[PDB]
């Protein structure tokens, strides 16, 4: 059987890379050398995807075992490693011959801007090459963006094609959905902050705002990007080194979210917007003004996290508008209904509350500080990064807490030493207040020398 | 691509904490892992001088929010990690997306597995300089600080992971010079032994080899 | 010789210009660097370990410049073998002290892991490495003594004192950290008859006695990774370095030279059955009088 594969291979494995050789597609997939090559190309081409690849590897192992069994049966009939040799023959078969780069580069120019260009010439090339931007290979994305920038063509000069020629082109109006979907999927696979910035400003400028489905899923994936992924956001918005490019990106994101919140505040009950959707994140949020809305819980988290980074350098309108509608003055918060059971659901969890108190926007902090449980107060005082003013006022809240109901407080307390150490640390760094909690701690823990 | 300043390493080596308050936060983010390790665990020192110095250390790093990620990294049960890694070692003898989409134990498991894999490959060979061990965590700029911090803990808390083999492995990886520099910054007294271990491998310039 | 190294540096620096041969230029420059390096340790302070680290680093820089220069001073005739090896052992001793102070600071600069001796794994292992380093240093001072056949008695006693300081530090490490339980040794030496032959040697014996009695007072008191062990070891290092180094006659001045030509029967084939019969012979050379310090009546030729 291995000798059969070695004898059948040179018909197509030694031939060039022309299409007719090995009867187009069928006979290619058959011949083990050809097959192996195409399979390795497809194989190289998240956790769920890894499991699929693992299943493919198991299937390949099963096929190799079947081929070995066939070889064993053939040997028995004749009387009456194999995989390594087959792979070596397939690799060393010396196929391909030629793709020389200038020939295919000049050939490709006719398909997009030349008189030969049409819908199909753009759409097929986009379906083949733009899809590579979502692949797990970072080299795939690098080569794809380099090739697109080279073939097609004052901030982010390299990616300026996506910002100044393609949205202006006639072939964008009909092929907007496929590019938008592919780039939106690629927002999770992209890593460099400048790339993420370019895609976000593009989706801010030239998206189908009018279509509800595109706006909704774009909001969902942007919400996943800004909530699920933090380190990309951290490098993009490092508060040690703010930049006006980050200002433009945050203004664009706030513009998109302001548009979404306007759209959902305009949505009334009894429309097609409210469905029994498959996804669990759907939440029916109704404001104190009677307005009704259906949006995803992670999108709410995305809206609130965007306000924790402070004001824009060059803009104040959308930030203030979003701050007012989301965190009003002298008014209560809206009540959310989880669509699964129509019950009240949490709005500001612990990982969210930490970023609200860390944020220096005052309204957000005093909104977070309202009705805090003693366990949550212990969690917040135990964390770092909080500014001095927020820390001091939370310490005064803790002072009120101990003076009112100390019983739950020292019921939940596992150990008093290290918190007393940290609260005196926070007291001496420049904070005022909180001395009552420290004094109560030292009341049962008098100071000791070391 | 910022390395630890000589003042920072000298001050950490001498534990000159009074001048450590005069160090910039971008500099301090490289030596922070060990720092948070110091102020949050078993002192094993029990001195009033060290009690105040630990107090000043806790004072200094309270103003940076990146310490919360390390606290999450420091709160795991490391016994499960050492058993899993040792069992895998006996068994054999788009990872940044997973990094963004996982908890601290999974991060530690994946990077510890990667690290043990590269030192096993290099120890199996005779110093062939397999410089293409992997480039998935070392290449993207986003996961430089986070994985560097996590590498400091995974080279400290499972202390059965040797410092010299970690240094040689980082020499084999793409962008490991910066990791080696900050890792020696975190564990300061190993500089002599790290350099000693790094000297006994190559003889000549190897015709200016890679 | 008397350890006054700052003014010695001042004089040696003045002598660089007026010498004529390059070998003596390197030699005088190396002496200037060694004197400056020893004066760097004059600025030490008791119970200040950061200053100790800084001063030892500053000393080691000039020591390294000096040893490079002194190796440049070597020539086929009069090769500075004793000076090279003595300075190299001082290099290794100061580097060992720097490493030990760094580790003692690493007791608090690297707290132990979640592991439930053991439970202080890193500090114990680096203590063990320091122990091995100091024992190897003592052994190297010993074979330097043994290679110093032509040296005067005072130079041999000075090298012996260097070896004893290395042994003292290693034993302090062992009896405080590694094996405190089984090191139940009583320091019952007749210290009254410690006839010190110099002020430098007197300070050496005084600091040995203080470190040893401090170790004896802390035999089993504490758990072996306490900060008091660190304080004891660092104070031992600082007190040992405070007494300045005292170069001696054999460093500067060679007398009673001797050597062996060692002629013998000379890529040599031999039949395996006809086992080799070798004649080994040699003459003992002498510089001026043969028997000035030591008299030679044996040659214990060892062959392998």
Contacts of A428 in chain B (CB under 8 A): 59
Assess C292–B contact: CB distance below 8 Å, yes or no: no
Look up residue B61 and give its two tokens. 């790093």
B106 CB-near residues (< 8 Å, 6+ apart): B98
Answer yes or no: are the C-beta atoms of A199 and A172 closer than 8 Å.
no
A270 dihedral zone (left: phi>0; alpha: psi -120 to 50; beta): left
Cα–Cα distance measured from residue A311 to residue A292, given in angstroms and rounded to the nearest whole number: 28
Nearest CA in chain A to B94: A136
CB contact under 8 A, B66 and A235: no
Look up residue B146 and give its two tokens. 């986070």
DSSP helix, strand, coil percent of chain C (3-state; round to 5) = 60, 5, 40
Answer yes or no: are the C-beta atoms of B30 and B4 closer than 8 Å.
yes
Q: Could you tell me the CA-to-CA distances from A159 to A156, A341, A343 in Å, in that order?
A: 6, 46, 46
Residue that the structure tokens 């005072």 belong to? C154
> What kind and span of H or E run contains C60?
helix C49-72
Look up residue B70 and give its two tokens. 């390390």
CB contact under 8 A, B46 and C226: yes
Cα–Cα distance measured from residue B93 to residue B171, given in angstroms and rounded to the nearest whole number: 23
Q: Could you tell me the CA-to-CA distances from A443 to A273, A307, A414, B1, C75 in Å, in that order?
A: 59, 41, 16, 49, 77
Cα–Cα distance measured from residue A67 to residue A65, given in angstroms and rounded to the nearest whole number: 5
Chain B neighbours (≥3 Cβ pairs under 8 A) are A, C
B175: nearest Cα among B206, B205, B145: B145
Cα angle B100, B104, B105 (rounded to 5 degrees) comes to 125
Look up residue C233 and give its two tokens. 């070891």
HEC-encoded secondary structure of C113-145: CCCCCCCCHHHHHHHHHHHHHHHHHHHHHHHHH
Are β-strands C263-264 and C284-286 bridged in parallel, bridged antiparallel, or unpaired? unpaired
Assess A46–B contact: CB distance below 8 Å, yes or no: yes
Burial C12-39 (b: 16+ CB within 10 A, else e): bbeeeeeeeeeeebbbbbbbbbbbbbbb
Q: Could you tell me the CA-to-CA distances from A116 to A101, A412, B85 in Å, in that order?
A: 21, 75, 59
Are β-strands A292-296 and A343-344 bridged in parallel, bridged antiparallel, or unpaired? unpaired
Answer yes or no: are the C-beta atoms of A192 and B96 closer than 8 Å.
no
B186: nearest Cα among B140, B145, B163, B152: B152
Look up residue A416 and give its two tokens. 């008093």
Contacts of A429 in chain B (CB under 8 A): 59, 62
Q: By what technique were these coordinates determined?
A: cryo-EM
Answer yes or no: are the C-beta atoms of C218 and C232 closer than 8 Å.
yes
Look up residue B113 and give its two tokens. 């597995």
The single-letter DSSP state of residue C253 is -
Nearest CA in chain A to B53: A425
Chain A neighbours (≥3 Cβ pairs under 8 A) are B
Burial A186-200 (b: 16+ CB within 10 A, else e): bbbbbbbbbbbbbbb
Nearest CA in chain B to A357: B65
Rounded to a whole number, what is the distance in angstroms from the first to the last CA of chain B? 20
Resolution in A: 4.1
CB contact under 8 A, B97 and A188: yes
Cα angle C273, C276, C277 (rounded to 5 degrees) comes to 130
CB contact under 8 A, B97 and A192: no
Q: Phi and psi (nearest 5°) for B202?
A: -95, 145
CB contact under 8 A, C110 and B16: no
Nearest CA in chain B to C55: B14
B171: nearest Cα among B183, B162, B161, B180: B180
Cα–Cα distance measured from residue A383 to residue C229, given in angstroms and rounded to the nearest whole number: 34
Cα–Cα distance measured from residue A96 to residue A34, given in angstroms and rounded to the nearest whole number: 11
State the angle between helix axes of A417-428 and A435-444 in degrees (0 to 180), rounded to the nearest 10. 150
Cα–Cα distance measured from residue A408 to residue A416, given in angstroms and rounded to the nearest whole number: 14
Assess A45–B contact: CB distance below 8 Å, yes or no: no
Radius of gyration, alpha carbons of chain A: 31
> What kind and span of H or E run contains C284?
strand C284-286
Q: Could you tell me the CA-to-CA distances from A51 to A48, A55, A140, A187, B105 in Å, in that order?
A: 5, 6, 21, 22, 20
Chain breaks in chain B (C to N over 2.5 A) after: 93
Cα angle C82, C83, C88 (rounded to 5 degrees) comes to 100
Assess A353–B contact: CB distance below 8 Å, yes or no: no
Q: Could you tell me the CA-to-CA distances from A260 to A167, A222, A274 in Å, in that order?
A: 22, 12, 15
10 Å CB burial of residue B3 (0-12, 13-18, 19+) is middle
CB contact under 8 A, C53 and B14: yes
Answer yes or no: are the C-beta atoms of B137 and B143 closer than 8 Å.
yes
Cα angle C58, C60, C61 (rounded to 5 degrees) comes to 70
Burial A26-59 (b: 16+ CB within 10 A, else e): eebeebbbbbbbeeeeeeeeeeeeeeeeeeeeee
User: How close A391 gets to chain B, by Cα (Å)?
Assistant: 11
CB contact under 8 A, B188 and C106: yes
Across the interface, of A188, A228, A422, the residue whose CB is closest to B58 is: A422
Cα angle C127, C130, C136 (rounded to 5 degrees) comes to 145
* Three-state DSSP class for residue C218: coil
Rounded to a whole number, what is the distance in angstroms from the first to the last CA of chain C? 41
HEC-encoded secondary structure of chain B: CCCCCHHHHHHHHHCCHHHHCCCCHHHHHHHHHHHHHHHHCCCCCCCHHHHHHHHHHHHHHHHCCCHHHHHHHHCCCHHHHHHHHHHHHHHHCCHHHHHHCCCHHHHHHHHHHHHHHHHHHHHHCCCCCCCCCCCCCCCCCCCHHHHHHHHHHHHHCCCCCCHHHHHHHHHHCCCHHHHHHHHHHHCHHHHHHHHHHHHCCCCCCCCCCC
Nearest CA in chain B to A388: B63
CB contact under 8 A, C111 and B78: no
Answer yes or no: are the C-beta atoms of C106 and B189 closer than 8 Å.
yes
Contacts of A383 in chain B (CB under 8 A): 68, 71
Look up residue A437 and give its two tokens. 């909690």
Are β-strands A343-344 and A335-338 bridged in parallel, bridged antiparallel, or unpaired? antiparallel
CB contact under 8 A, C122 and B44: no
User: How close B99 gets to chain A, by Cα (Å)?
Assistant: 10
B77 CB-near residues (< 8 Å, 6+ apart): B105, C114
Cα–Cα distance measured from residue A204 to residue C242, given in angstroms and rounded to the nearest whole number: 71
Burial B89-99 (b: 16+ CB within 10 A, else e): eeeeebbbbeb
Cα–Cα distance measured from residue A382 to residue A416, given in angstroms and rounded to the nearest whole number: 12
Look up residue C66 and give its two tokens. 């000096």
**Partners of A344 in the β-ladder:** A337
Answer yes or no: are the C-beta atoms of A228 and A271 closer than 8 Å.
no
Q: How many CB atoms lie within 10 A of CB A409?
A: 18
The answer for A 137-176 residues in CB contact with B (under 8 A) is 137-138
Contacts of A421 in chain B (CB under 8 A): 55, 58
Look up residue A59 and give its two tokens. 């299937």
Q: Phi and psi (nearest 5°) for A337?
A: -115, 120
Cα–Cα distance measured from residue C60 to residue A212, given in angstroms and rounded to the nearest whole number: 73
CB contact under 8 A, B65 and A240: no
Cα–Cα distance measured from residue B15 to residue B38, given in angstroms and rounded to the nearest whole number: 11
A101: nearest Cα among A150, A135, A153: A150
Contacts of C95 in chain B (CB under 8 A): 192
Contacts of C107 in chain B (CB under 8 A): 44-45
Across the interface, of C108, C113, C121, the residue whose CB is closest to B50 is: C108
Cα–Cα distance measured from residue B69 to residue B166, given in angstroms and rounded to the nearest whole number: 23
10 Å CB burial of residue C151 (0-12, 13-18, 19+) is buried
Residue that the structure tokens 């260097």 belong to? C162
Assess A32–B contact: CB distance below 8 Å, yes or no: no
Contacts of B158 in chain C (CB under 8 A): 113
* Three-state DSSP class for residue C285: strand
Cα–Cα distance measured from residue A112 to residue C12, given in angstroms and rounded to the nearest whole number: 82
Assess C84–B contact: CB distance below 8 Å, yes or no: no
CB contact under 8 A, C105 and B189: yes
Burial A267-287 (b: 16+ CB within 10 A, else e): beeeeebbeeeeeebbbbbeb
Nearest CA in chain B to C102: B189
Across the interface, of A232, A426, A450, the residue whose CB is closest to B142 is: A232
Contacts of C53 in chain B (CB under 8 A): 13-14
CB contact under 8 A, B55 and A425: yes
User: How close A31 gets to chain B, by Cα (Å)?
Assistant: 31
Cα–Cα distance measured from residue A216 to residue C168, given in angstroms and rounded to the nearest whole number: 77
CB contact under 8 A, B42 and C103: no
CB contact under 8 A, C111 and B192: no
**Partners of A295 in the β-ladder:** A283
Q: Could you tell me the CA-to-CA distances from A249 to A182, A305, A320, B168, C30 in Å, in that order?
A: 20, 14, 17, 41, 63
Contacts of B51 in chain C (CB under 8 A): none
Q: Could you tell me the CA-to-CA distances from A143 to A129, A133, A151, B94, C124 in Å, in that order?
A: 10, 9, 12, 16, 51
User: How close B105 gets to chain C, by Cα (Å)?
Assistant: 15
HEC-encoded secondary structure of chain A: CHHHHHHHHHHHCCCCCCCCCCCCCHHHHHCHHHHHHHHHHHHHCCHHHHHHHHHHHHHHHHHHHHHHHHHHHHHHHHHCCHHHHHHHHHHHCCCCCCCCHHHHHHHHHCCCCCCCCCHHHHHHHHHHHHHHHHCCCHHHHHHHHHHHHHHHCCCCCCCHHHHHCCCCCHHHCCCHHHHHHHHHHHHHHCCCHHHHHHHHHHHHHCCCCCCHHHHHHHHHHHHHHHHHCCHHHHHHCCCCCCCHHHHHHHHHHHHHHHHHHHHHHHCCCCCCCCCCCCCCCEEEEECCCCCEEEEEHHHHHHHHHHCCCCCCCCCCHHHHHHHHHHCCCCCCCCEEEECCCCEECCCCCHHHHHHHHHCCCHHHHHHHHCCCCHHHHHHHHCCCCCCHHHHHHHHHHHHHHHHHCHHHHHHHCCCCHHHHHHHHHHHHCCCCCCHHHHHHHHHHCCCCCC
Nearest CA in chain B to A447: B48
Across the interface, of B13, B15, B78, the residue whose CB is closest to C113 is: B78
C248: nearest Cα among C137, C167, C150: C150
Across the interface, of A192, A229, A384, the residue whose CB is closest to B64 is: A384
Answer yes or no: are the C-beta atoms of C238 and C52 closer than 8 Å.
yes
Across the interface, of C53, C111, C115, the residue whose CB is closest to B13 is: C53
A374 CB-near residues (< 8 Å, 6+ apart): A401, A405, A408, A409, A412
The single-letter DSSP state of residue C192 is G
The single-letter DSSP state of residue C41 is G
Look up residue A374 and give its two tokens. 């003693």
């Amino acid at each position: 059987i291995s000798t059969l594969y070695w004898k059948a291979w040179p018909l197509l494995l030694v031939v060039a890379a022309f299409n007719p050789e090995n009867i187009g597609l069928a006979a290619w997939e058959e011949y083990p050398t050809l097959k192996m090559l195409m399979e390795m190309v497809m194989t190289n081409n998240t956790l769920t995807d890894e499991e699929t690849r693992t299943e493919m590897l198991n299937r390949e192992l099963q096929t190799a075992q079947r081929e070995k069994q066939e070889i064993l049966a053939f040997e028995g009939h004749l009387a009456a490693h194999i995989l390594d040799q087959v792979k070596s023959l397939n690799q060393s078969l010396r196929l391909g011959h030629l793709l020389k780069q200038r020939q295919l580069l000049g050939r490709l120019q006719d398909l997009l801007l030349g008189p030969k260009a049409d819908e199909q010439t753009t759409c097929e090339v986009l379906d083949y090459f733009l899809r590579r931007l979502g692949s797990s290979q970072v080299a795939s994305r690098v080569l794809a963006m380099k090739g697109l920038s080279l073939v097609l063509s004052d901030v982010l000069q390299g990616y300026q094609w996506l910002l100044r020629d393609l949205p202006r082109l006639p072939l964008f109006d009909s092929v907007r959905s496929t590019t938008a979907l592919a780039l939106q999927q690629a927002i999770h696979m992209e890593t460099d902050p400048q790339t993420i910035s370019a895609y976000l400003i593009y989706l801010s400028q030239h998206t189908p705002v009018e279509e509800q489905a595109q706006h909704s899923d774009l909001a969902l994936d942007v919400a996943r990007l800004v909530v699920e992924r933090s380190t990309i956001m951290s490098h993009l918005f490092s508060k040690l080194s703010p930049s006006a490019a980050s200002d433009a990106v945050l203004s664009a994101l706030l513009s998109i979210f302001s548009r979404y919140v306007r759209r959902m505040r305009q949505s009334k009950e009894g429309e097609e917007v409210y469905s029994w959707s498959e996804s669990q994140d759907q939440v029916f949020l109704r404001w104190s003004s009677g307005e009704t809305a259906t949006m995803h819980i992670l999108v709410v988290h995305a809206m609130v996290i965007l306000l924790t980074l402070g004001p824009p350098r060059a803009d104040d309108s959308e930030f203030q508008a979003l701050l007012d509608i989301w965190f009003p003055e002298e008014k209560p918060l809206p009540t959310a209904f989880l669509v699964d059971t129509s019950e009240e659901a949490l709005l500001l969890p612990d990982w969210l509350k930490l970023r609200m108190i860390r944020s220096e926007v005052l309204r957000l902090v005093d909104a977070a500080l309202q009705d805090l449980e003693p366990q949550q107060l212990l969690l917040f005082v135990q964390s770092f990064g909080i500014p001095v003013s927020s820390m001091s006022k939370l310490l005064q809240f803790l002072d009120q807490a101990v003076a009112h109901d100390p019983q739950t407080l020292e019921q939940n307390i596992m150990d008093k030493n290290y918190m007393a150490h940290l609260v005196e640390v926070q007291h001496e760094r420049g904070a005022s207040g909180g001395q009552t909690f420290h004094s109560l701690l030292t009341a049962s823990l008098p100071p000791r020398r070391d | 691509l910022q390395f630890v300043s000589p003042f920072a390493f000298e001050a950490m080596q001498k534990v000159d904490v009074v001048c450590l308050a005069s160090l910039s936060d971008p500099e301090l983010r490289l030596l922070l892992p060990c720092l948070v390790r110091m102020a949050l665990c078993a002192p094993a020192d029990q001195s009033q001088s060290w009690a105040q110095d630990k107090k000043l250390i806790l004072r200094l790093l309270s103003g940076v929010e990146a310490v919360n990620s390390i606290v999450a990294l420091l709160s795991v049960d490391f016994h499960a990690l050492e058993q899993d890694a040792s069992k895998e070692q006996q068994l054999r003898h788009g990872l940044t997306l997973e990094f963004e989409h996982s908890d601290s134990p999974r991060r530690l498991r994946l990077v510890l597995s990667e690290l043990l894999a590269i030192m096993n490959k290099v120890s199996e060979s005779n110093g062939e300089f397999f410089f293409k061990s992997s480039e998935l965590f070392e290449s993207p700029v986003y996961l430089e600080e986070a994985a560097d911090v996590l590498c400091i803990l995974q080279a400290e808390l499972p202390s059965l992971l040797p410092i010299v083999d970690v240094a040689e492995a980082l020499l084999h990886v793409r962008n490991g010079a910066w990791f080696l520099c900050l890792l020696v910054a975190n564990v300061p007294d190993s500089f002599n032994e790290v350099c000693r271990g790094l000297i006994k491998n190559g003889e000549r310039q190897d015709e200016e080899s890679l | 010789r008397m350890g006054n190294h700052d003014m010695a540096k001042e004089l040696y620096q003045s002598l660089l210009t007026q010498v004529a041969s390059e070998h003596f230029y390197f030699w005088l420059n190396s002496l200037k660097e060694f004197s400056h390096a020893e004066q760097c340790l004059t600025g030490l302070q008791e119970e200040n370990y950061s200053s100790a680290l800084s001063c030892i680093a500053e000393s080691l820089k000039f020591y390294h410049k000096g040893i490079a220069s002194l190796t440049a001073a070597s020539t086929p005739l009069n090769p500075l073998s004793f000076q090279c090896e003595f300075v190299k052992l001082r290099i290794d001793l100061l580097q060992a002290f720097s490493q030990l102070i760094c580790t003692c600071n690493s007791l608090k600069t690297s707290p132990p892991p979640a592991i439930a001796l053991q439970r202080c794994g890193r500090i114990s292992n680096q203590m063990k490495q320091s122990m091995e380093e100091f024992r190897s240093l003592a052994s190297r001072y010993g074979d330097l003594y043994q290679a110093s056949f032509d040296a005067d008695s005072a130079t041999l006693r000075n090298v012996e004192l260097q070896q004893q300081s290395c042994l003292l530090i290693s034993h302090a490490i062992e009896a405080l950290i590694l094996d405190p339980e089984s090191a139940s040794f009583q320091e019952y030496g007749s210290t009254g008859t410690a006839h010190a032959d110099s002020e430098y040697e007197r300070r050496m014996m005084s600091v040995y006695n203080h470190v040893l009695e401090e170790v004896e007072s802390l035999n089993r008191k504490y758990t072996p990774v306490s900060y008091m062990h660190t304080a004891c070891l660092c104070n031992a290092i600082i007190a040992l370095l405070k007494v300045p180094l005292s170069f001696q006659r054999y460093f500067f001045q060679k007398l009673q030279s001797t050597s062996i030509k060692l002629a013998l029967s000379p890529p040599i084939a031999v039949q395996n059955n006809q086992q080799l019969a070798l004649k080994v012979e040699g003459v003992v050379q002498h510089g001026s009088k043969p028997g000035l310090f030591r008299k030679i009546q044996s040659v214990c030729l060892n062959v392998s």
